[PDB]
């Protein structure tokens, strides 16, 4: 009522005074400081009149930057800080696959388009520059794949491996080292581990997307719930006759639990 | 010094003013200041070491330029780049490109020795995931993809370090030579066709950077803002 209106007016005056004091302090800084502004960073970017086409189930991190001709299929994941800008060419990422965080899937020329198949992992900080990776492959963390490289189905490039131009990684084979020597044969248990890793990371992507697609109200509500349910007392709960069950909001899905 | 004292006093005054603003917001019932927003700034400064970036030079919003970077005209810094020059300066010429997810940083502390400022010349590609650490690269050069360059590395004009090469401290890559391998070593001499390819790649990549900057300078989407705000 009138009390609320008066308190709102007082708060407005106090807010104006505080903003004036903040501006005075910023002026006294000497102009060196760079004021923090809005985000200005767009996750999905349309370039060359050519828009990204991502599925409704793909988890694309807000820190991830997809630009231009990236087309990502069902159940895929693009993690935090990964860059996929198909502007001079196209990038086609299949279904059930994951491109982990801080990685880069760039394409060149205008022709060596970047193709990544299904149920394939491209590990942390991995660099791709126009590769053709087939289904159910495995590129390790830090592996860099140059122009025209082709990796066959069920083939592994180990961590920190340079794979040069026009090199073909054959099926059921592991390639490791700076000039990417042949290493091993990637046995059946390893292939099963590859498939299980793809499925588990798809589930982890679903969990991450569910957590990351929350607005301010959901974030605040779950923060309050987490703070209140962080620690529990059983003596007083038993004395009162209460249980204090964990809410379903903080229950992590069993797909990502050991 | 007196400048740093005034900087600290300004910080105190700014903190007090922001506290007063938040008190007024709480009086109004506006709790949106509690909304945790990203505080990342594309250009971040130290006390008196604000980065310099010429106009008509592309800097991606995801790229972070910390400290004493000195970007020149018509050059590009792409998404995910980190350019740290707090301990010592970073000089970056005109027409060069710092491609995606790259890092150009100066050494922290003087434990190893004197801190060498980072120098990058004109019309030079500085790699696609390179990790340059206080080195000097001359004009019309091609630092390769995911390449490590340690302090003291001097890459000469029209010289190539291939992808994945790790050039160790106090190593010079001479004119018209390609160096690669984890213990970076010479592989094969360059050709005038490859040098022309380097220059043409630099030019067309600067053009692509201009296109990216033009596309990115568009106004923020009110539709997207409303979509995020409401549910």
């Amino acid at each position: 009522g009138t009390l609320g209106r008066a308190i709102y007016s007082v708060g407005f005056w106090i807010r104006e005074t505080g903003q004036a004091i903040d501006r005075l302090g910023s002026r006294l800084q000497g102009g060196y400081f760079f004021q923090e502004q809005l985000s200005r960073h767009r996750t999905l970017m349309n370039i060359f009149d050519k828009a990204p086409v991502v599925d409704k189930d793909v988890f694309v991190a807000p820190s991830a930057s997809v630009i231009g001709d990236v087309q990502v299929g069902r159940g895929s994941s693009i993690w935090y800080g990964c860059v996929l800008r198909g502007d001079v060419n196209s990038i086609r990422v299949g279904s059930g696959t994951n491109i982990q965080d801080n990685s880069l899937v760039h394409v060149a020329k205008s022709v060596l388009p970047t193709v990544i198949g299904d149920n394939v992992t491209v590990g942390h900080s991995a660099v791709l520059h126009g590769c053709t990776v087939e289904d159910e492959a495995f590129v390790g963390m830090g592996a860099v794949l140059l122009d025209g490289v082709v990796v066959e189905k069920n083939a592994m490039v180990a961590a920190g491996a340079l794979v040069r131009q026009n090199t073909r990684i054959p099926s059921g084979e592991v390639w490791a080292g700076n000039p990417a020597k042949f290493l091993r044969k990637l046995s059946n248990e390893e292939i099963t581990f590859i498939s299980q890793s793809a499925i588990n990371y798809t589930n982890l992507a679903q969990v991450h997307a569910a957590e990351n697609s929350k607005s301010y109200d959901e974030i605040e509500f779950e923060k309050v719930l987490r703070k209140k349910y962080a620690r529990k007392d059983e003596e007083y709960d038993s004395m009162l006759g209460v249980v204090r069950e964990i809410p379903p909001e903080l229950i992590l899905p069993d797909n990502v639990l050991p | 010094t007196l400048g740093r004292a005034f900087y600290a006093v300004g910080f105190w005054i700014r903190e007090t003013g922001q506290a007063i603003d938040r008190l007024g917001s709480r009086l109004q019932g506006n709790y949106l200041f509690q909304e945790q927003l990203s505080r990342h700034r594309p250009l971040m400064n130290l006390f008196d070491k604000y980065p310099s970036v010429h106009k008509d030079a592309f800097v991606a919003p995801s790229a972070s330029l910390l400290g004493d970077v000195h970007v020149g005209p018509a050059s590009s810094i792409w998404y995910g780049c980190v350019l740290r020059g707090d301990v010592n300066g970073i000089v970056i010429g005109s027409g060069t490109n710092i491609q995606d997810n790259s890092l150009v940083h100066v050494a922290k502390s003087n434990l190893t020795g004197k801190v060498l400022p980072t120098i990058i010349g004109d019309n030079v590609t500085v790699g696609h995931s390179a990790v340059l650490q206080g080195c000097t690269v001359e004009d019309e050069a091609f630092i390769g993809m995911g390449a490590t360059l340690l302090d003291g590395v001097y890459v000469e004009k029209h010289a190539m370090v291939a992808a994945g090469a790790l050039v160790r401290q106090n190593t010079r890559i001479p004119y018209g030579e390609v160096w690669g391998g984890n213990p970076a070593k010479f592989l094969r001499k360059l050709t005038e066709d490859e040098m022309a390819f380097f220059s043409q790649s630099a030019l067309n990549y600067s053009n692509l950077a201009q296109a990216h900057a033009a596309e990115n300078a568009k106004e923020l989407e009110e539709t997207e803002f409303v979509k995020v705000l409401h549910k």
């Binding site: 009390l3 609320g4 209106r5 308190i7 709102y8 007082v10 708060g11 | 009086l27 109004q28 019932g29």
Partner: peptide, 30 residues
């Protein structure tokens, strides 16, 4: 649209302003 809708917070603000005024009057009269 320009009113605080929390009755409890409004009463708390009124009590705080009353406290400040009372403390100031006590200091002045002491």
């Amino acid at each position: 649209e320009r009113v605080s809708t929390d009755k409890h917070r409004n009463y708390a603000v009124v009590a705080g302003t009353i406290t400040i005024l009372g403390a100031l009057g006590w200091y002045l009269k002491g």
